[PDB]
Coordinates of C-alpha atoms (C1' of nucleotides) in Angstrom, one line a residue:
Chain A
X101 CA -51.4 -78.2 -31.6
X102 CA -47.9 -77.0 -32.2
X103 CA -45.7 -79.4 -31.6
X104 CA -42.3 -80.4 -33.6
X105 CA -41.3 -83.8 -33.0
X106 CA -38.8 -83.2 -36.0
X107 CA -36.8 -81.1 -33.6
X108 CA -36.2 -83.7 -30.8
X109 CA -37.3 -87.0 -33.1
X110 CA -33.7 -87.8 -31.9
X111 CA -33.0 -91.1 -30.4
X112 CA -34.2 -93.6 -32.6
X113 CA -33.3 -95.8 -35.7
X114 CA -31.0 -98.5 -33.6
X115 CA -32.8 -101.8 -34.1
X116 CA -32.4 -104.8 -36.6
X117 CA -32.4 -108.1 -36.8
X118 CA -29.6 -110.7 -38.4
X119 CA -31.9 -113.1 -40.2
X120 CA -33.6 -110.1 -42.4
X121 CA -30.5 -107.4 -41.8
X122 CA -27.7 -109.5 -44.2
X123 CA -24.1 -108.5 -43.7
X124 CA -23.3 -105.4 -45.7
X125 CA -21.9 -106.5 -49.3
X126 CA -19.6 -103.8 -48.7
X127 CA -18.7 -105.6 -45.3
X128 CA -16.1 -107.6 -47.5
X129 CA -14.6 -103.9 -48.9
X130 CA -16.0 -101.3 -46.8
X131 CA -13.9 -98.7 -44.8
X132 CA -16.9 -98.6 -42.5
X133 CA -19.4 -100.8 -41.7
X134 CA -23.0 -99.3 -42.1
X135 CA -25.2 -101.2 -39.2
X136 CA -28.1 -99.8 -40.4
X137 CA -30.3 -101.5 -38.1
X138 CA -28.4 -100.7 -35.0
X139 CA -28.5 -97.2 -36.6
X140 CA -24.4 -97.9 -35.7
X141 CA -21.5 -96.3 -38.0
X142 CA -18.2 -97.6 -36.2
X143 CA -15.8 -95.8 -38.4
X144 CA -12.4 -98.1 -38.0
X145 CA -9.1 -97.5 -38.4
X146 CA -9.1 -98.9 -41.7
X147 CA -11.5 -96.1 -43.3
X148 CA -9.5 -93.2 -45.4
X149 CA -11.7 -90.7 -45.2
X150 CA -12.4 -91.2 -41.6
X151 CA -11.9 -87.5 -41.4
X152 CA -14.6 -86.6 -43.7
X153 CA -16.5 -89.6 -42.9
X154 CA -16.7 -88.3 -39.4
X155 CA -17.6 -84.7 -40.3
X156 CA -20.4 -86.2 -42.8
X157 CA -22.1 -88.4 -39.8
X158 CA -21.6 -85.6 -37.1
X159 CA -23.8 -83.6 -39.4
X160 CA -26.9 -85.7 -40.7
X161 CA -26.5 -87.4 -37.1
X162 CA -24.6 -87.6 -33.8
X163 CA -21.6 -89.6 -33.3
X164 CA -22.3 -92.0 -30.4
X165 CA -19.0 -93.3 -30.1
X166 CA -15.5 -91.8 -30.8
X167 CA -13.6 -94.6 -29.7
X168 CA -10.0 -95.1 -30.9
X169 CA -10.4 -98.3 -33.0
X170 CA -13.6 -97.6 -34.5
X171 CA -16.3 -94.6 -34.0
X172 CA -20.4 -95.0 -33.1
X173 CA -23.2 -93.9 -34.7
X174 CA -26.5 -92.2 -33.4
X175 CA -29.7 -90.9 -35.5
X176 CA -30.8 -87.1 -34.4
X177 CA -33.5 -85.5 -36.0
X178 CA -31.6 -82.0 -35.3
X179 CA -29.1 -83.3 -36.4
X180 CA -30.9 -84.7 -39.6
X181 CA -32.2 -81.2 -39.9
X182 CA -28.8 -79.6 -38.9
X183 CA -27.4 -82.4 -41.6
X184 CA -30.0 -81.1 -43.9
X185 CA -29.1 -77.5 -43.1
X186 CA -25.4 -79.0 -43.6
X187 CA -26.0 -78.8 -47.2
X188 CA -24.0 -82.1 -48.4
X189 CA -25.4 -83.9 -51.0
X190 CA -27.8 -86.4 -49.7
X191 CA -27.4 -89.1 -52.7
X192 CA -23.2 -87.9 -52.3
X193 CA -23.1 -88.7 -48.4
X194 CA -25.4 -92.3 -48.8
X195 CA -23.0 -93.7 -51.3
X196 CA -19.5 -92.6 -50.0
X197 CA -21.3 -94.1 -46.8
X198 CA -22.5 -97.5 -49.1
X199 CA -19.0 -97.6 -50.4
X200 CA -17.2 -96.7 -47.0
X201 CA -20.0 -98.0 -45.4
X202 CA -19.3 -102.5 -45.1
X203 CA -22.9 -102.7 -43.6
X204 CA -25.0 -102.1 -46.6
X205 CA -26.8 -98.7 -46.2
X206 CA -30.2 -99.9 -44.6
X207 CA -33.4 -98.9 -46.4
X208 CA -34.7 -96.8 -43.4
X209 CA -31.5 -95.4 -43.1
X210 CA -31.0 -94.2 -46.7
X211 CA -34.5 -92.8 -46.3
X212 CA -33.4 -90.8 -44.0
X213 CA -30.5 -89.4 -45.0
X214 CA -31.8 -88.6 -48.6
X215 CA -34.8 -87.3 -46.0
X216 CA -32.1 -85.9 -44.4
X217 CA -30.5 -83.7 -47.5
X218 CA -33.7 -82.4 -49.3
X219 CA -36.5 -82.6 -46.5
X220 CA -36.0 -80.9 -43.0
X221 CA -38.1 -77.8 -44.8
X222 CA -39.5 -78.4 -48.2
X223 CA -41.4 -75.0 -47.9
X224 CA -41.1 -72.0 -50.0
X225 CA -41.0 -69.2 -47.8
X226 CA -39.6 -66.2 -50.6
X227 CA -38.6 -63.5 -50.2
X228 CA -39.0 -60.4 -52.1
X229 CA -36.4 -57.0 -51.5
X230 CA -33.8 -58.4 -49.3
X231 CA -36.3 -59.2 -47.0
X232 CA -38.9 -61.9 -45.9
X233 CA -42.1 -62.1 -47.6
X234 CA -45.0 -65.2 -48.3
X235 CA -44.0 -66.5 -51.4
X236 CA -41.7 -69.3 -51.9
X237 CA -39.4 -70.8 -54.9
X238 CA -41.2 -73.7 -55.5
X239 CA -45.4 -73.7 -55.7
X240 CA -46.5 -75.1 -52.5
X241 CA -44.5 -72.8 -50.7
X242 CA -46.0 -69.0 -52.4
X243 CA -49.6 -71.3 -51.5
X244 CA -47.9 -71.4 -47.7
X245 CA -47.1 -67.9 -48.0
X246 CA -50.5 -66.6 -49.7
X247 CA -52.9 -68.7 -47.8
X248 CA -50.9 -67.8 -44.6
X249 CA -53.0 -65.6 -41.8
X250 CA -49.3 -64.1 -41.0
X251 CA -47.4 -64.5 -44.0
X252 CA -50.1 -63.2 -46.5
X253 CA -52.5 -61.3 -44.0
X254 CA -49.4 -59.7 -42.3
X255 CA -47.9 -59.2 -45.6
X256 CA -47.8 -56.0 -47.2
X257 CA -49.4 -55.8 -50.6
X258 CA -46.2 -54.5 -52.3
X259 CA -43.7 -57.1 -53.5
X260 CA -40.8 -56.1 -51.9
X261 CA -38.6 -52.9 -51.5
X262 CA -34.9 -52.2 -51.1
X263 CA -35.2 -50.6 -47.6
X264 CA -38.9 -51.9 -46.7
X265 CA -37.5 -55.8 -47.1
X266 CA -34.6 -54.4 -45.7
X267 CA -36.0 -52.9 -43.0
X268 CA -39.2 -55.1 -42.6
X269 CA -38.4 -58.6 -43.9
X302 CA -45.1 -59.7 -40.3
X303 CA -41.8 -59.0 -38.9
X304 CA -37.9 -59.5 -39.7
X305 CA -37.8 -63.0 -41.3
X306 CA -34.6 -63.0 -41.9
X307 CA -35.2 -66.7 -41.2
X308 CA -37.1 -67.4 -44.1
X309 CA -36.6 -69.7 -47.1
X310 CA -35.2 -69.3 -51.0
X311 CA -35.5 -65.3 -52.0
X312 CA -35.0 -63.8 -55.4
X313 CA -38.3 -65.6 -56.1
X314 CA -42.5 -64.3 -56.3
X315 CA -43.4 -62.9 -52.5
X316 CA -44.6 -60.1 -51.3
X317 CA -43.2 -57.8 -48.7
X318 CA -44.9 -58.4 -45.3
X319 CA -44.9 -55.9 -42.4
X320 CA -43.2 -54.9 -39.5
X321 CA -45.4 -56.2 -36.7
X322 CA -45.3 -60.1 -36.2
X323 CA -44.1 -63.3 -37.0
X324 CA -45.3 -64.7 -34.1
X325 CA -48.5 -65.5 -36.4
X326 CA -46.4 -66.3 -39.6
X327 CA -44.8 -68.8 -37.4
X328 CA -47.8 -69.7 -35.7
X329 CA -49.6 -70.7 -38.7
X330 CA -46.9 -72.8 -40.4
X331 CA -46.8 -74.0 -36.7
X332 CA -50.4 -75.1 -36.8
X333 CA -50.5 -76.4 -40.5
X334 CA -47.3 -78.1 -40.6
X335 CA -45.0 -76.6 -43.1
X336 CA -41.2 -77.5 -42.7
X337 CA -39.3 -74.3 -44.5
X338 CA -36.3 -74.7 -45.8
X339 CA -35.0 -71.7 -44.2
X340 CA -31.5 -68.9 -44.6
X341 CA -30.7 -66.8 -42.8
X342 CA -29.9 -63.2 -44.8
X343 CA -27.2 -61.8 -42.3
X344 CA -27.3 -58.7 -44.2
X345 CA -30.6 -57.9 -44.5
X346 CA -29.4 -57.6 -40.9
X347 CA -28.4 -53.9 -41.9
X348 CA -30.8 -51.9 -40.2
X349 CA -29.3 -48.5 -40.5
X350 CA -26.5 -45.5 -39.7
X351 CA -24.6 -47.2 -37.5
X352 CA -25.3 -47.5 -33.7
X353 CA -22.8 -46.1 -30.6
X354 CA -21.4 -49.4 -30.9
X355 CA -17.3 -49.6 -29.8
X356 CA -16.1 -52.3 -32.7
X357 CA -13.2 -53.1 -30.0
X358 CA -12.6 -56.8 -29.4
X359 CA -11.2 -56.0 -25.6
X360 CA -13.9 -58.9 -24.1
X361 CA -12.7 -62.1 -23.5
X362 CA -12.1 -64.3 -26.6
X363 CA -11.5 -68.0 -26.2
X364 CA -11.7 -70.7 -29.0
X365 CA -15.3 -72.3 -28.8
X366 CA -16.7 -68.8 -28.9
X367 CA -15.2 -67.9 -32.2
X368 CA -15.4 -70.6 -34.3
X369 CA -18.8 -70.8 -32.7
X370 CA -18.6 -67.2 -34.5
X371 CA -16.6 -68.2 -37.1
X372 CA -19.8 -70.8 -37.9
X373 CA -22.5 -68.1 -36.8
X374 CA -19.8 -65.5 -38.6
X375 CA -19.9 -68.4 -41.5
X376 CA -18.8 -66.9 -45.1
X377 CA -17.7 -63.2 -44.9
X378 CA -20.5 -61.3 -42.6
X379 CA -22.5 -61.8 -39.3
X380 CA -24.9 -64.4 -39.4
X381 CA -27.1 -64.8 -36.0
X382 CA -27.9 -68.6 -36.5
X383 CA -29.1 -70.8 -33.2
X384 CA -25.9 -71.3 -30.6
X385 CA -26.6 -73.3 -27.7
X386 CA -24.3 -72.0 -24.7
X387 CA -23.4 -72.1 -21.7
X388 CA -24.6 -69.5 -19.3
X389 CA -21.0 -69.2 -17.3
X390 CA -18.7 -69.7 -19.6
X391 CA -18.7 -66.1 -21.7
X392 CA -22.0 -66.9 -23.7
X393 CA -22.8 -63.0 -23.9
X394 CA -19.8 -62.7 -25.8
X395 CA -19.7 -63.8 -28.9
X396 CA -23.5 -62.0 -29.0
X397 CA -21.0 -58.5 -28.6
X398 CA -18.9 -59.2 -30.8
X399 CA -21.8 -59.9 -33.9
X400 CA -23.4 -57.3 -32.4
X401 CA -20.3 -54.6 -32.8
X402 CA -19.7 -56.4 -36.0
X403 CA -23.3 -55.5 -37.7
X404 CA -22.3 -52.3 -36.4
X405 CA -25.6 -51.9 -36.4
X406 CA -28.5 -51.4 -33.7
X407 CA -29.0 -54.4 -31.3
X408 CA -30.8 -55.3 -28.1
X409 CA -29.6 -58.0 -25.3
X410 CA -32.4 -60.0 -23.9
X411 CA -31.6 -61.7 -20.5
X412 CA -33.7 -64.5 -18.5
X413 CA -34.6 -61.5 -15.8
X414 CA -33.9 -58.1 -15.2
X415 CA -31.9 -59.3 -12.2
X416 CA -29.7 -61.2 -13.8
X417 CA -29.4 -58.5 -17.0
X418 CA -27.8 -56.6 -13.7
X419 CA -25.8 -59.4 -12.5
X420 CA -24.5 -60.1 -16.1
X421 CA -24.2 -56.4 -17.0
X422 CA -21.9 -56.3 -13.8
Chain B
dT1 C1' -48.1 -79.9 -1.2
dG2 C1' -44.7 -76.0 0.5
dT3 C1' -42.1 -72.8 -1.8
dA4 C1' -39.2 -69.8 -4.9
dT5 C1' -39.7 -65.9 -8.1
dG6 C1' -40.2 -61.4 -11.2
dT7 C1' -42.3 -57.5 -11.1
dA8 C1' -45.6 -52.8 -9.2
dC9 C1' -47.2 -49.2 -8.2
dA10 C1' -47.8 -46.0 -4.7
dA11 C1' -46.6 -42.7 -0.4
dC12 C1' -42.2 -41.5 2.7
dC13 C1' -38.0 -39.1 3.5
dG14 C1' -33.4 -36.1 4.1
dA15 C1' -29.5 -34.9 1.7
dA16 C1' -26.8 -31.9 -0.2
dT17 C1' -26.1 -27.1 -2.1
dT18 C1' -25.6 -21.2 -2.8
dC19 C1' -27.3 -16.6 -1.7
dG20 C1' -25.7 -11.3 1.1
dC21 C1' -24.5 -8.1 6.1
dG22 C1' -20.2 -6.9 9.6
dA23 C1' -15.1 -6.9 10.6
dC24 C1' -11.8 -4.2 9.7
dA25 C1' -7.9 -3.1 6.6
dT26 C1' -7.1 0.0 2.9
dT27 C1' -4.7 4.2 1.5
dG28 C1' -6.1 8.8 1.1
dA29 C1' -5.6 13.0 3.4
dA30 C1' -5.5 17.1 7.0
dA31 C1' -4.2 18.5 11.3
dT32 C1' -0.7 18.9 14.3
dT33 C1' 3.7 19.4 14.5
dT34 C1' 8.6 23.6 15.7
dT35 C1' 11.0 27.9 14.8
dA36 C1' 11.6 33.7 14.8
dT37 C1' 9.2 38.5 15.8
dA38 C1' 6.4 42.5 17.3
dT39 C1' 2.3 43.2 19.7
dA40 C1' -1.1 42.4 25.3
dC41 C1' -3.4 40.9 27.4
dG42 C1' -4.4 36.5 31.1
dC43 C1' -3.9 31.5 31.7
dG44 C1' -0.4 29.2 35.6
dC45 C1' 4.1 28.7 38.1
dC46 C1' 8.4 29.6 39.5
dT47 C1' 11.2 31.7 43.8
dT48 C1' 11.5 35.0 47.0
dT49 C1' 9.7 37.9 50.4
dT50 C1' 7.4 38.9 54.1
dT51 C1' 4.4 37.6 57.7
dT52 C1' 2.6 34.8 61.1
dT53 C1' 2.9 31.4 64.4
dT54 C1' 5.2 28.5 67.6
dT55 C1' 8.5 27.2 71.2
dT56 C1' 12.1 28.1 74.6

DNA sequence: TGTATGTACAACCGAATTCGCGACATTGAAATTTTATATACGCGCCTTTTTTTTTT
């Protein structure tokens, strides 16, 4: 129906053997030691770039195990995704791994990896106007677009305008993939169907996120004053939602109870533009209001 | 299998809020106030006078 398991496919690729899995040939001089079987990365103290070793493995996948002597290494589809939607080079991050890595990069796990950097959306959504649109920057993905109930049928005739993809994005995509290519400006109304669609036929997007096609207007009654609590998580969980120069709303997973409402105020006063708070009930949009 | 939950849509209720007549106080003023003097009457009232009455 409309189910991902690419979103929670996390929790598998630990399992080898020792008479087919050989001993890494960079086991001898390895900084690591790739178990690709085990799906294991124990990063030891004898790695260099354990530093960026550990960044590169906490995005493609989840680090297990931070122990002192060595690290441990988990597989997480999210994370492949996330790892994907890191944006290091897929070949870059196998071979530093190969060469870092003592256990030889295992065959699945290279798969993946590569998998990782180029797939987790192969789609084409484009994008025409500053905007969302079906269209795409490779074929397959203005044939998603066209051939889409949501994306085409939702989508206005007209190829994209300054304000209409500005203020339209059938409604904002400003999750959508590579613009600047062929689309056509779709509506106002609902991506419920555009999503529901790629939903029902499959198509992994590789998706942005154009923070400033979150403008949206004259600016709203909106007091840019920072006087709400700020403590670290929150902002570098800006800072990454913030990411390169301007407000980016990206996915944030927090904690109801420990100031999640408040890094959503502060990219909300820093748009300075119109936004709406959406709580679980209207109870609680009380209880968190007070 | 018992229960916790969000949300509704309709009749009930009392709570809190702003308008002019009467009380006098106001200052405005006239009236009254005091005095001389002739006039003459008619108020009342003063003392004295005379009369009457009583008691020895």
């Amino acid at each position: 129906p409309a189910d991902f398991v690419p979103d929670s496919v996390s929790g598998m690729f630990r399992s080898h053997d020792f008479s087919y899995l050989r001993l890494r040939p960079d086991h001898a001089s390895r900084p690591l030691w790739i178990s690709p079987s085990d799906g294991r990365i124990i990063l030891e103290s004898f790695s260099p770039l354990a530093e960026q070793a550990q960044d590169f493995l906490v995005t493609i996948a989840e680090p297990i195990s931070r122990p002192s002597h060595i690290h441990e290494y988990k597989i997480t589809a999210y994370s492949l995704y996330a790892a994907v939607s890191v944006g290091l080079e897929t070949d870059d991050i196998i071979s530093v791994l190969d060469r870092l890595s003592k256990v030889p990069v295992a065959e699945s796990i290279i798969n993946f990896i590569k998998g990782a950097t180029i797939s987790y959306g192969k789609v084409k959504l484009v994008i025409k106007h500053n905007r969302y649109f079906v269209e795409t920057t490779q074929a397959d993905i203005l044939q998603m677009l066209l051939n889409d109930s949501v994306i085409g049928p939702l989508r206005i005739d007209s190829d994209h305008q300054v304000q209409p993809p500005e203020d339209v994005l059938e409604r904002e995509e400003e999750d959508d993939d590579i613009d600047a290519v062929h689309s056509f400006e779709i509506a106002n109304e609902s991506v419920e169907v555009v999503k529901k669609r790629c939903q029902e036929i499959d198509y992994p997007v590789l998706e942005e996120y154009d923070f400033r096609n979150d403008h949206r207007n004259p600016d709203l009654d909106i007091d840019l004053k920072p006087s709400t609590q700020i403590r670290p998580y929150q902002e570098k969980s800006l800072s990454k939602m913030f990411g390169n120069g301007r407000a980016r709303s990206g996915i944030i997973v927090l904690p109801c109870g420990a100031g999640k409402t408040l890094v959503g105020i502060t990219a909300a006063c820093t748009i300075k533009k119109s936004v709406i708070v959406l709580c679980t009930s209207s109870v609680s949009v009380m209880q968190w209001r007070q």
